[PDB]
Coordinates of C-alpha atoms in Angstrom, one line a residue:
Chain A
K1 CA -34.3 -35.8 10.7
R2 CA -35.2 -34.6 7.1
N3 CA -32.2 -32.3 7.7
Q4 CA -30.6 -33.2 4.3
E5 CA -33.8 -32.5 2.3
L6 CA -34.4 -29.2 4.3
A7 CA -30.8 -28.1 3.3
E8 CA -31.4 -29.3 -0.4
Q9 CA -34.6 -27.2 -0.5
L10 CA -32.9 -24.1 1.1
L11 CA -30.1 -24.3 -1.5
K12 CA -32.8 -24.1 -4.4
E13 CA -34.5 -21.1 -2.5
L14 CA -31.1 -19.2 -2.1
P15 CA -30.9 -16.1 -4.4
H16 CA -27.4 -16.7 -6.1
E17 CA -25.8 -20.2 -6.8
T18 CA -22.3 -21.1 -5.4
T19 CA -19.9 -18.9 -7.4
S20 CA -18.3 -20.5 -10.5
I21 CA -14.5 -20.2 -11.2
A22 CA -15.6 -17.9 -14.2
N23 CA -17.6 -15.8 -11.7
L24 CA -14.6 -15.7 -9.3
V25 CA -12.5 -14.2 -12.2
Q26 CA -15.3 -11.7 -13.2
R27 CA -15.6 -10.6 -9.5
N28 CA -11.8 -10.3 -9.2
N29 CA -11.7 -8.2 -12.4
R30 CA -14.4 -5.8 -11.0
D31 CA -12.3 -5.5 -7.7
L32 CA -9.0 -4.8 -9.6
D33 CA -10.9 -2.3 -11.9
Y34 CA -12.4 -0.5 -8.8
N35 CA -9.0 -0.4 -7.0
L36 CA -7.1 0.7 -10.2
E37 CA -9.6 3.6 -10.7
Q38 CA -9.1 4.8 -7.1
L39 CA -5.3 4.6 -7.6
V40 CA -5.6 6.6 -10.9
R41 CA -7.7 9.2 -9.0
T42 CA -5.1 9.4 -6.1
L43 CA -2.2 9.9 -8.6
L44 CA -4.2 12.5 -10.6
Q45 CA -5.0 14.3 -7.3
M46 CA -1.2 14.5 -6.7
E47 CA -0.7 15.8 -10.3
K48 CA -3.4 18.5 -9.7
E49 CA -1.7 19.5 -6.4
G50 CA 1.6 20.0 -8.3
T51 CA 3.4 16.7 -7.5
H52 CA 4.3 15.5 -11.1
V53 CA 3.6 11.8 -11.6
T54 CA 6.9 10.1 -12.8
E55 CA 8.6 6.7 -12.6
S56 CA 10.7 8.1 -9.8
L57 CA 7.7 9.2 -7.7
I58 CA 6.2 5.7 -8.0
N59 CA 9.6 4.2 -6.9
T60 CA 9.7 6.5 -3.8
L61 CA 6.0 5.7 -3.0
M62 CA 6.9 1.9 -3.2
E63 CA 10.1 2.3 -1.1
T64 CA 8.1 4.1 1.8
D65 CA 5.5 1.3 2.6
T66 CA 2.8 4.1 2.0
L67 CA 0.6 1.8 -0.2
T68 CA -1.3 -1.5 0.8
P69 CA -0.2 -4.7 -0.9
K70 CA -3.2 -4.5 -3.3
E71 CA -2.2 -0.9 -4.2
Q72 CA 1.5 -2.0 -4.8
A73 CA 0.2 -4.7 -7.1
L74 CA -1.7 -2.1 -9.2
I75 CA 0.5 1.1 -8.9
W76 CA 2.4 0.4 -12.2
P77 CA -0.8 -0.2 -14.3
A78 CA -2.2 3.0 -12.5
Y79 CA 1.0 4.9 -13.5
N80 CA 0.8 3.7 -17.2
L81 CA -2.9 4.7 -17.4
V82 CA -2.2 8.1 -15.8
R83 CA 0.6 8.7 -18.4
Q84 CA -1.8 7.7 -21.3
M85 CA -4.5 10.1 -19.9
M86 CA -2.1 13.0 -19.4
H87 CA -0.7 12.5 -23.0
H88 CA -4.3 12.1 -24.5
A89 CA -5.4 15.4 -22.7
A90 CA -2.3 17.2 -24.1
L91 CA -3.1 16.7 -27.8
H92 CA -5.3 19.2 -29.7
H93 CA -8.3 17.6 -31.7
Chain B
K1 CA 3.5 22.9 -18.1
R2 CA -0.3 23.1 -17.8
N3 CA 0.1 19.7 -16.0
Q4 CA -2.0 20.8 -13.0
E5 CA -4.9 22.0 -15.2
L6 CA -4.7 18.8 -17.4
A7 CA -5.0 16.7 -14.1
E8 CA -7.9 19.0 -12.8
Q9 CA -9.7 18.4 -16.2
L10 CA -9.1 14.6 -16.2
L11 CA -10.5 14.4 -12.6
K12 CA -13.8 16.0 -13.9
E13 CA -13.9 13.6 -16.9
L14 CA -13.4 10.4 -14.7
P15 CA -16.5 8.3 -14.4
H16 CA -16.8 7.9 -10.5
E17 CA -15.6 10.5 -7.9
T18 CA -13.0 9.5 -5.1
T19 CA -14.9 7.1 -2.8
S20 CA -16.6 8.8 0.2
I21 CA -16.3 7.2 3.8
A22 CA -20.1 6.5 3.4
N23 CA -19.3 4.7 0.1
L24 CA -16.4 2.8 1.7
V25 CA -18.9 1.5 4.3
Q26 CA -21.6 0.6 1.6
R27 CA -18.9 -1.2 -0.5
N28 CA -17.6 -3.1 2.6
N29 CA -21.3 -4.1 3.5
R30 CA -21.8 -5.5 -0.1
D31 CA -18.5 -7.5 0.3
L32 CA -19.5 -8.9 3.8
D33 CA -23.0 -9.7 2.4
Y34 CA -21.4 -11.5 -0.6
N35 CA -18.9 -13.5 1.6
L36 CA -21.6 -14.3 4.2
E37 CA -23.9 -15.7 1.4
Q38 CA -21.0 -17.9 0.1
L39 CA -20.3 -19.2 3.6
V40 CA -24.1 -19.9 4.2
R41 CA -24.1 -21.9 0.9
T42 CA -20.9 -23.8 1.9
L43 CA -22.5 -24.7 5.4
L44 CA -25.8 -25.8 3.7
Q45 CA -23.8 -27.9 1.1
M46 CA -22.3 -29.7 4.2
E47 CA -25.9 -30.1 5.8
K48 CA -27.2 -31.5 2.4
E49 CA -24.2 -34.0 2.2
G50 CA -25.1 -35.3 5.8
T51 CA -22.6 -33.2 7.9
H52 CA -25.1 -31.6 10.5
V53 CA -24.2 -27.9 11.1
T54 CA -23.7 -27.4 14.9
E55 CA -21.7 -25.1 17.3
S56 CA -19.1 -28.0 17.6
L57 CA -18.6 -28.3 13.8
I58 CA -17.9 -24.6 13.6
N59 CA -15.4 -24.9 16.5
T60 CA -13.6 -27.7 14.7
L61 CA -13.6 -25.8 11.4
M62 CA -12.1 -22.8 13.3
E63 CA -9.4 -25.0 15.1
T64 CA -8.2 -26.5 11.8
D65 CA -7.2 -23.3 9.9
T66 CA -9.5 -24.5 7.0
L67 CA -11.1 -21.0 6.6
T68 CA -9.5 -17.7 5.4
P69 CA -9.4 -14.8 8.0
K70 CA -12.4 -13.2 6.2
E71 CA -14.3 -16.5 6.5
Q72 CA -13.4 -16.9 10.2
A73 CA -14.7 -13.3 10.8
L74 CA -18.1 -14.3 9.3
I75 CA -18.4 -18.0 10.2
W76 CA -20.6 -17.3 13.4
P77 CA -23.0 -15.0 11.6
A78 CA -23.2 -17.6 8.8
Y79 CA -23.9 -20.3 11.5
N80 CA -26.6 -18.2 13.1
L81 CA -28.3 -17.5 9.7
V82 CA -28.1 -21.3 8.7
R83 CA -29.8 -22.2 12.0
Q84 CA -32.6 -19.6 11.4
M85 CA -33.1 -20.9 7.8
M86 CA -33.1 -24.6 9.0
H87 CA -35.7 -23.7 11.7
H88 CA -37.8 -21.6 9.3
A89 CA -37.9 -24.5 6.7
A90 CA -38.9 -27.0 9.5
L91 CA -42.2 -25.2 10.5
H92 CA -45.5 -26.0 8.6
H93 CA -47.4 -22.8 7.2
Chain C
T1 CA -69.9 -16.9 -5.0
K2 CA -67.0 -17.2 -7.5
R3 CA -67.1 -13.3 -7.5
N4 CA -65.1 -13.5 -4.2
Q5 CA -62.5 -15.9 -5.8
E6 CA -61.9 -13.6 -8.9
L7 CA -61.6 -10.5 -6.7
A8 CA -58.9 -12.4 -4.6
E9 CA -57.2 -13.6 -7.8
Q10 CA -57.1 -9.9 -9.1
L11 CA -55.9 -8.5 -5.7
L12 CA -53.1 -11.2 -5.7
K13 CA -51.8 -9.8 -9.1
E14 CA -52.0 -6.2 -7.7
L15 CA -50.0 -7.0 -4.4
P16 CA -46.6 -5.3 -4.2
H17 CA -43.6 -7.5 -5.2
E18 CA -42.7 -9.7 -2.1
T19 CA -39.2 -11.0 -1.4
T20 CA -39.4 -14.7 -0.5
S21 CA -39.2 -15.6 3.2
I22 CA -35.6 -16.9 3.0
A23 CA -34.4 -13.9 0.9
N24 CA -36.0 -11.6 3.5
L25 CA -34.3 -13.5 6.4
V26 CA -30.9 -12.9 4.6
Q27 CA -31.6 -9.2 3.9
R28 CA -32.8 -8.7 7.5
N29 CA -29.7 -10.4 8.9
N30 CA -27.4 -8.3 6.6
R31 CA -29.1 -5.0 7.9
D32 CA -28.6 -6.2 11.5
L33 CA -24.9 -7.1 10.9
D34 CA -24.2 -3.8 9.0
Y35 CA -25.9 -1.8 11.9
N36 CA -23.9 -3.6 14.6
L37 CA -20.6 -3.4 12.6
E38 CA -21.1 0.4 12.1
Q39 CA -21.6 0.9 15.9
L40 CA -18.3 -1.1 16.6
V41 CA -16.4 0.9 14.0
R42 CA -17.7 4.1 15.7
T43 CA -16.6 2.7 19.1
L44 CA -13.1 1.9 17.8
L45 CA -12.7 5.3 16.1
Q46 CA -13.8 7.0 19.4
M47 CA -10.9 5.1 21.1
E48 CA -8.4 6.2 18.3
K49 CA -9.7 9.9 18.6
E50 CA -9.1 9.8 22.4
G51 CA -5.5 8.6 21.9
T52 CA -5.8 4.8 22.3
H53 CA -4.3 3.6 19.0
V54 CA -6.3 0.7 17.6
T55 CA -4.0 -2.3 17.0
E56 CA -4.3 -6.1 16.7
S57 CA -2.9 -6.3 20.3
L58 CA -5.5 -3.8 21.7
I59 CA -8.3 -6.0 20.1
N60 CA -6.6 -9.2 21.6
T61 CA -6.5 -7.6 25.1
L62 CA -10.1 -6.3 24.9
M63 CA -11.2 -9.9 23.9
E64 CA -9.1 -11.5 26.8
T65 CA -10.7 -10.5 30.2
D66 CA -14.1 -10.2 28.5
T67 CA -14.1 -6.3 28.1
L68 CA -16.3 -6.8 24.9
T69 CA -19.7 -8.4 24.8
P70 CA -20.1 -11.7 22.9
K71 CA -22.1 -9.8 20.2
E72 CA -19.1 -7.3 19.9
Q73 CA -16.6 -10.2 19.8
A74 CA -18.6 -11.7 16.9
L75 CA -17.9 -8.6 14.7
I76 CA -14.7 -7.1 16.2
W77 CA -12.2 -8.3 13.5
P78 CA -14.3 -7.0 10.5
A79 CA -14.7 -3.7 12.5
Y80 CA -10.9 -3.6 13.1
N81 CA -10.1 -4.3 9.4
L82 CA -12.6 -1.5 8.3
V83 CA -11.1 1.0 10.8
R84 CA -7.6 0.2 9.5
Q85 CA -8.8 0.8 5.8
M86 CA -10.5 4.1 6.9
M87 CA -7.4 5.4 8.7
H88 CA -5.2 4.5 5.6
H89 CA -7.9 6.1 3.2
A90 CA -7.9 9.3 5.3
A91 CA -4.0 9.4 5.3
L92 CA -4.2 9.7 1.5
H93 CA -6.9 12.4 0.6
Chain D
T1 CA 0.8 10.5 17.1
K2 CA -1.6 13.5 17.1
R3 CA -2.1 12.7 13.3
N4 CA -3.9 9.4 14.2
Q5 CA -6.3 11.3 16.6
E6 CA -7.2 14.0 14.1
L7 CA -7.7 11.4 11.3
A8 CA -10.1 9.5 13.7
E9 CA -11.9 12.8 14.6
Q10 CA -12.4 13.6 10.9
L11 CA -13.6 10.0 10.1
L12 CA -16.2 10.3 12.9
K13 CA -17.7 13.4 11.2
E14 CA -17.6 11.6 7.7
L15 CA -19.4 8.4 9.0
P16 CA -22.9 7.8 7.6
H17 CA -25.8 8.9 9.8
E18 CA -26.5 6.3 12.5
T19 CA -29.9 5.9 14.1
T20 CA -29.7 5.6 17.9
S21 CA -30.1 2.1 19.3
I22 CA -33.7 2.5 20.6
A23 CA -34.8 4.2 17.3
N24 CA -33.2 1.4 15.3
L25 CA -35.0 -1.3 17.4
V26 CA -38.3 0.4 16.5
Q27 CA -37.5 0.8 12.8
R28 CA -36.3 -2.9 12.6
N29 CA -39.5 -4.1 14.4
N30 CA -41.6 -2.0 12.0
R31 CA -39.9 -3.5 8.9
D32 CA -40.4 -7.1 10.3
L33 CA -44.1 -6.5 11.2
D34 CA -44.7 -4.9 7.7
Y35 CA -43.1 -7.9 6.1
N36 CA -45.0 -10.6 8.2
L37 CA -48.3 -8.6 7.8
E38 CA -47.9 -8.6 3.9
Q39 CA -47.2 -12.4 4.0
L40 CA -50.3 -13.1 6.1
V41 CA -52.4 -10.8 3.8
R42 CA -51.1 -12.9 0.7
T43 CA -51.9 -16.2 2.6
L44 CA -55.5 -15.0 3.4
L45 CA -56.1 -13.9 -0.2
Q46 CA -54.7 -17.3 -1.5
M47 CA -57.4 -18.9 0.7
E48 CA -60.1 -16.6 -0.7
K49 CA -58.9 -17.4 -4.3
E50 CA -59.1 -21.2 -3.5
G51 CA -62.7 -20.8 -2.3
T52 CA -62.2 -20.5 1.5
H53 CA -64.1 -17.2 2.2
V54 CA -62.1 -15.0 4.7
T55 CA -64.5 -14.3 7.7
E56 CA -64.2 -13.4 11.4
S57 CA -65.2 -17.1 12.1
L58 CA -62.4 -18.5 9.9
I59 CA -59.8 -16.4 11.8
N60 CA -61.3 -17.6 15.2
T61 CA -61.0 -21.3 14.0
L62 CA -57.4 -20.7 12.8
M63 CA -56.6 -19.3 16.3
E64 CA -58.5 -21.9 18.4
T65 CA -56.4 -24.7 16.7
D66 CA -52.6 -24.1 16.8
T67 CA -52.7 -23.7 13.0
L68 CA -50.9 -20.3 13.2
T69 CA -47.4 -19.5 14.7
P70 CA -47.1 -17.0 17.6
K71 CA -45.9 -14.3 15.1
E72 CA -48.9 -15.0 12.8
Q73 CA -51.4 -14.9 15.8
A74 CA -49.9 -11.5 16.8
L75 CA -50.8 -10.1 13.2
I76 CA -53.8 -12.2 12.1
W77 CA -56.4 -9.5 13.0
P78 CA -54.6 -6.6 11.2
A79 CA -54.1 -9.0 8.2
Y80 CA -57.9 -9.8 8.4
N81 CA -58.9 -6.1 8.6
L82 CA -56.6 -5.2 5.6
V83 CA -57.9 -8.2 3.5
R84 CA -61.5 -7.1 4.1
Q85 CA -60.6 -3.4 3.1
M86 CA -58.9 -4.8 -0.1
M87 CA -61.9 -7.1 -1.0
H88 CA -64.3 -4.1 -0.4
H89 CA -62.0 -1.7 -2.4
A90 CA -61.9 -4.2 -5.3
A91 CA -64.7 -3.8 -7.9
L92 CA -66.5 -0.7 -6.1
Chain E
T1 CA -27.6 24.6 -48.0
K2 CA -28.9 24.4 -44.4
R3 CA -30.4 21.0 -45.5
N4 CA -26.9 19.5 -45.1
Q5 CA -26.7 21.0 -41.5
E6 CA -30.1 19.7 -40.4
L7 CA -29.3 16.2 -41.9
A8 CA -26.0 16.2 -39.9
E9 CA -27.9 17.4 -36.7
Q10 CA -30.4 14.5 -37.1
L11 CA -27.6 11.9 -37.8
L12 CA -25.8 13.1 -34.6
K13 CA -28.9 12.3 -32.5
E14 CA -29.3 8.8 -34.2
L15 CA -25.5 7.8 -33.6
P16 CA -25.0 4.9 -31.1
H17 CA -24.1 6.0 -27.5
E18 CA -20.4 6.7 -27.4
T19 CA -18.2 6.2 -24.3
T20 CA -16.1 9.4 -23.8
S21 CA -12.4 9.1 -24.9
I22 CA -11.0 8.9 -21.3
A23 CA -13.7 6.3 -20.2
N24 CA -12.8 4.2 -23.3
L25 CA -9.0 4.4 -22.4
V26 CA -9.9 3.0 -18.9
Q27 CA -12.2 0.3 -20.3
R28 CA -9.6 -0.7 -22.9
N29 CA -6.8 -0.8 -20.2
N30 CA -9.0 -2.9 -17.9
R31 CA -9.6 -5.5 -20.7
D32 CA -5.9 -5.7 -21.5
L33 CA -4.9 -6.1 -17.7
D34 CA -7.8 -8.7 -17.3
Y35 CA -6.5 -10.7 -20.4
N36 CA -2.9 -10.6 -19.3
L37 CA -3.8 -11.6 -15.7
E38 CA -5.9 -14.6 -16.9
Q39 CA -2.9 -15.8 -19.0
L40 CA -0.5 -15.5 -15.9
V41 CA -3.1 -17.3 -13.7
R42 CA -3.3 -20.1 -16.4
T43 CA 0.6 -20.3 -16.5
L44 CA 0.8 -20.5 -12.6
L45 CA -2.0 -23.3 -12.5
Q46 CA -0.1 -25.2 -15.3
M47 CA 3.0 -25.2 -12.9
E48 CA 0.8 -26.4 -9.9
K49 CA -0.7 -29.1 -12.1
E50 CA 2.8 -30.3 -13.2
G51 CA 3.8 -30.6 -9.4
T52 CA 5.6 -27.2 -8.9
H53 CA 3.6 -25.9 -5.9
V54 CA 2.9 -22.2 -6.3
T55 CA 4.2 -20.3 -3.2
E56 CA 5.4 -16.8 -2.3
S57 CA 9.1 -18.1 -2.5
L58 CA 8.6 -19.6 -6.0
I59 CA 7.3 -16.2 -7.2
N60 CA 10.3 -14.5 -5.5
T61 CA 12.8 -16.9 -7.3
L62 CA 11.0 -16.5 -10.7
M63 CA 11.3 -12.7 -10.2
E64 CA 15.0 -12.8 -9.2
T65 CA 17.2 -14.0 -12.2
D66 CA 14.6 -12.5 -14.5
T67 CA 12.8 -15.8 -15.4
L68 CA 9.5 -13.7 -15.9
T69 CA 9.1 -10.8 -18.5
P70 CA 8.7 -7.2 -17.2
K71 CA 5.0 -7.4 -18.3
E72 CA 4.6 -10.7 -16.3
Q73 CA 6.3 -9.1 -13.2
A74 CA 3.8 -6.2 -13.4
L75 CA 0.8 -8.6 -12.7
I76 CA 2.5 -11.6 -11.0
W77 CA 1.3 -10.8 -7.4
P78 CA -2.4 -10.3 -8.4
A79 CA -2.1 -13.6 -10.4
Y80 CA -0.6 -15.3 -7.4
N81 CA -3.3 -14.1 -5.0
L82 CA -6.1 -15.2 -7.4
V83 CA -4.4 -18.7 -7.9
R84 CA -4.3 -19.1 -4.0
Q85 CA -8.1 -18.0 -3.8
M86 CA -9.0 -20.6 -6.6
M87 CA -7.0 -23.4 -4.9
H88 CA -8.8 -22.7 -1.6
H89 CA -12.2 -22.4 -3.3
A90 CA -11.6 -25.8 -5.1
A91 CA -10.6 -27.4 -1.7
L92 CA -14.2 -26.5 -0.4
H93 CA -16.7 -27.6 -3.2
Chain F
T1 CA 0.6 -33.5 -2.5
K2 CA -1.2 -35.1 -5.4
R3 CA -4.4 -33.2 -4.2
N4 CA -2.8 -29.9 -5.2
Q5 CA -2.1 -31.2 -8.7
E6 CA -5.6 -32.6 -9.3
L7 CA -7.2 -29.3 -7.9
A8 CA -5.0 -27.3 -10.5
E9 CA -6.0 -29.8 -13.3
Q10 CA -9.7 -29.3 -12.4
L11 CA -9.4 -25.4 -12.1
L12 CA -7.7 -25.4 -15.6
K13 CA -10.9 -27.0 -17.1
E14 CA -13.2 -24.6 -15.2
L15 CA -11.2 -21.4 -16.4
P16 CA -13.3 -19.1 -18.7
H17 CA -12.6 -19.5 -22.5
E18 CA -9.3 -17.7 -23.4
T19 CA -8.8 -16.4 -26.9
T20 CA -5.3 -17.3 -28.2
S21 CA -2.8 -14.4 -28.1
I22 CA -2.8 -13.7 -31.9
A23 CA -6.7 -13.9 -32.1
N24 CA -6.8 -11.5 -29.1
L25 CA -4.4 -9.0 -30.8
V26 CA -6.8 -8.9 -33.8
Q27 CA -10.0 -8.6 -31.6
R28 CA -8.4 -5.8 -29.6
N29 CA -7.2 -4.0 -32.7
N30 CA -10.8 -4.3 -34.2
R31 CA -12.4 -2.8 -31.0
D32 CA -9.9 0.1 -31.1
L33 CA -10.3 0.8 -34.8
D34 CA -14.2 0.7 -34.4
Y35 CA -14.0 3.1 -31.5
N36 CA -11.6 5.6 -33.3
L37 CA -13.7 5.3 -36.5
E38 CA -16.9 6.2 -34.7
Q39 CA -15.2 9.3 -33.0
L40 CA -14.0 10.5 -36.4
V41 CA -17.5 10.0 -37.9
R42 CA -19.0 12.1 -35.0
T43 CA -16.2 14.8 -35.6
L44 CA -17.0 15.0 -39.3
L45 CA -20.8 15.2 -38.7
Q46 CA -20.2 17.9 -36.0
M47 CA -18.3 19.9 -38.8
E48 CA -21.3 19.3 -41.3
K49 CA -23.7 20.5 -38.6
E50 CA -21.6 23.7 -38.0
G51 CA -21.7 24.5 -41.8
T52 CA -18.3 22.9 -43.0
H53 CA -19.6 20.6 -45.8
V54 CA -17.7 17.3 -45.7
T55 CA -16.0 16.7 -49.1
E56 CA -13.0 14.8 -50.6
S57 CA -11.2 18.3 -50.8
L58 CA -11.8 19.0 -47.0
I59 CA -10.3 15.6 -46.2
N60 CA -7.3 16.3 -48.5
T61 CA -6.8 19.8 -46.8
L62 CA -7.1 18.2 -43.3
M63 CA -4.4 15.7 -44.3
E64 CA -2.0 18.1 -46.2
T65 CA -1.8 20.2 -42.9
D66 CA -0.8 18.1 -39.8
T67 CA -4.4 18.9 -38.4
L68 CA -5.0 15.1 -37.8
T69 CA -3.1 12.6 -35.6
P70 CA -1.5 9.5 -37.2
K71 CA -4.3 7.4 -35.8
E72 CA -6.9 9.8 -37.3
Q73 CA -5.1 9.9 -40.7
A74 CA -5.2 6.0 -40.8
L75 CA -9.0 6.1 -40.5
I76 CA -10.0 9.4 -42.1
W77 CA -11.1 7.9 -45.5
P78 CA -13.2 5.1 -44.0
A79 CA -14.8 7.8 -41.7
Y80 CA -15.4 10.0 -44.8
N81 CA -17.0 7.1 -46.8
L82 CA -19.3 6.2 -43.9
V83 CA -20.3 10.0 -43.3
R84 CA -21.2 10.2 -47.1
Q85 CA -23.2 6.9 -46.9
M86 CA -25.1 8.3 -43.7
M87 CA -25.8 11.7 -45.4
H88 CA -27.2 9.9 -48.5
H89 CA -29.2 7.4 -46.3
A90 CA -30.7 10.4 -44.4
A91 CA -33.9 11.8 -45.9
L92 CA -34.1 9.4 -49.0

């Protein structure tokens, strides 16, 4: 009933093509980068409030089921980056 | 050890602020819009290949555990939109 | 006269940018889904506020015995997932 | 827990502004009318460009035949009026 | 002379846009995580290709008895999740 | 299942281009050197603007005191050379 040609025509008119594997990786990188920046901000909010961010704090946050699986996947990279940022801010010039 | 002031300063230097509730909704809308467009494309790929997209096809795709939970959440809105698009493409002028 | 044709040709260049018909059908469908999702999210948070904890089993019971409309049932899981994210986000911060 | 209730109460204040259901039905209908009007205006100007002069009689003939969809027939006169305004506005 | 100062002031306006130090630390950390994640994803797909099906229990066993490096263990779950998405995406399409 | 293996084999061909580990260590080190060089160049020009003329003797004094980090000391001469080129290039 011309249904196949209609579909073929709609597919050309659709804004974005079907996502490549390369585009799935890029999209997943952006999502990890977004979630990592929120975790970094959460950990620095704790540091600002007077809860010092240490390996032991991260271990206790992990033991306590506080964090989503996506957060638990990124909590160590967030920890590493927070430490780098705290050390960078410490040095003069 | 000036750790709180360091954290307070880093938080001002961070590109994006902590995400509002409004921004969580906007971000969730963009993710639903992205996943809906991919589902619409998958269903139209089926229509192009000669698998007619009907309420019964969607029921069978749902019975068979083929789709992720996020896909199952959007398969009916994708179905509705595919039907609208197929009907819009059918009419002359 | 060909004056009329040139006037029309000039007006066609000056017309505001127009989304294609299919692209506008998608955008319009996204806005409608986003609006209906935000109402459901509000309804579920109203339940939580009043002391009815929003859980997978509450959603199952509301769906059994037809307490939700078919339009609600279409979006109830995305609404549920977003409410859970929001309750977790509020618990931090 | 009382914590869950207060969290929900706080989230309800933080939720983006929501148009009431009736107000949103109007707004949505305005957007759709504006979109369909601008398509019809473009279609009528495409005809003018191709050498079909856009007149009251052309609109009557398009209506008397089922050449237009119901949605188009609803907006064809406002599209006609606007096309005439635009043709008059052009090259004053 | 104040010639030297004005020359410097002019050069400072002409210098390419510079990301702030903290923003560059984030960007650099994202690139490193993205690179290491893509290597792990490749390693896991190589296993799948060779006939070792990539499952939650395989990841658990590789993590127990220290078969993965600490740097691998840091990203193994995000790699796992992405491999699962990619295998599901390839099954459609 | 043989299906899983072929899917993986196909995904491996579709994966974005990956620099080898050694090549990526070089590229990453180049980006970091380029970034830290441009910061030092900016710092030296900020000094020139403020009235501290940038000379070989100033760089020697900055080095002889532990005023610079190890990363800065590694790049201070290339930053100096580039600042001198830029000051000479400006107002030829």
